[PDB]
Design goal:
The structure holds two protein chains of two kinds. By secondary structure, chain A is mainly beta. Chain A has one domain: Immunoglobulin-like. Chain A has no helices and eleven strands. In chain A, the strands form two sheets. In chain A, strands 2, 4, 5, 6, 9, 10 and 11 form a seven-stranded mixed beta sheet that branches. A four-stranded antiparallel beta sheet of chain A has the order 1-3-8-7, with no helix packed on it. Chain A is globular, with a radius of gyration of 13 Å. Chain B is mostly helical. Chain B has one domain: Lysozyme (Orthogonal Bundle), CATH 1.10.530.10. In chain B, strand 2 and strand 3 form a beta hairpin. The longest helix of chain B is centred in the first third of the chain and has 12 residues. Chain B is globular and about 45 Å long. Classes of the chains: A mainly beta, B mainly alpha. Chains A and B meet through loops of A and helix 4 of B. The PDB classes it as hydrolase/immune system. Keywords: beta sandwich, immunoglobulin fold, alpha-beta orthogonal bundle, hydrolase-immune system complex. The assembly is dimeric. Crystal structure of the VHH D3-L11 in complex with hen egg white lysozyme. Chain A is Immunoglobulin heavy chain antibody variable domain.
Chain lengths: ~120, ~130
């Protein structure tokens, strides 16, 4: 395999909004989770928002709950991250991840649970 | 052991799967048919080093320990060998945990693709349960 392409990154002022897109190619409904991860400068990669494509259920890391919304367009194998009311702490390289196998919800925000990765897009607040 | 359709339906009913997490019995029988063709000894290796075991093809990366899978979490706290038994108890109990994970029976690919949205009751018809 699955290829993941991110787009929509860039600069945004604190309090603004940005929308990131993750397009998958190489399969459709075999993809289970489509998830957004991020890596702030000098920090470890962390799961931000996960979406289970067959139910639309979403999972968020505490620091973004209420501010970020992950959604999808299952038919087009697209996952979106709507970043609303961004904060300076959100500055980082955002990367899309996916799996074609079920992952227990408790591990849906762990990088090791994902088998496919995009290349990342920079977001600067 | 390769179960007969109704033989499995009866066993699954005895195990309390009928309407478990809202899934009527037929869903479970249909899931087993497409996941393992009713074979308790079915096994399938994956590209990530994990293996799917039993009549409900439960994965060793998350649910059971086969001691050969990288990044395993054994959430069902059982050896995967227990999922290959002619006695489906271990498979059923683990399936109950999986289907309670938060995304229903979607965790079973075979169920999503050949059972979900179909007349699953057909799978228990004629079984005189």
């Amino acid at each position: 395999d699955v290829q993941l392409v991110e787009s929509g990154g860039g600069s945004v002022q604190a309090g603004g909004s940005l929308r990131l897109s993750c397009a998958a190619s190489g399969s459709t409904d075999s993809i289970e989770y489509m998830t957004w991860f991020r890596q702030a400068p000098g920090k470890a990669r962390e799961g931000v928002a996960a979406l289970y494509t067959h139910t639309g259920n979403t999972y968020y890391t505490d620091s973004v709950k209420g501010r970020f919304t992950i959604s999808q367009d299952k038919a087009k194998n697209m996952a979106y991250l709507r970043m609303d009311s961004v904060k300076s702490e959100d500055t980082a390289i955002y990367t899309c991840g996916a799996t074609r196998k079920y992952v227990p919800v408790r591990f849906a925000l762990d990088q090791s649970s994902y088998d496919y990765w995009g290349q990342g897009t920079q977001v600067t607040v | 052991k390769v179960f007969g359709r109704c033989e499995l339906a009866a066993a699954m009913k005895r195990h309390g799967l009928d309407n478990y997490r809202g899934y009527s019995l037929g869903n479970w029988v249909c899931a087993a048919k497409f996941e393992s063709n009713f074979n308790t000894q079915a096994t399938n290796r994956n590209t990530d080093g994990s293996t799917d075991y039993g009549i409900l093809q439960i994965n060793s990366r998350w649910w059971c320990n086969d001691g050969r899978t990288p990044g395993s979490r054994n959430l069902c706290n059982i050896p995967c060998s227990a999922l290959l038994s002619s006695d489906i108890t271990a498979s059923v109990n683990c399936a109950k945990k999986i289907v309670s994970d938060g995304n229903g029976m979607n965790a079973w690919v075979a169920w999503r693709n050949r059972c979900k949205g179909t007349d699953v009751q057909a799978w228990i018809r004629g079984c005189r349960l």
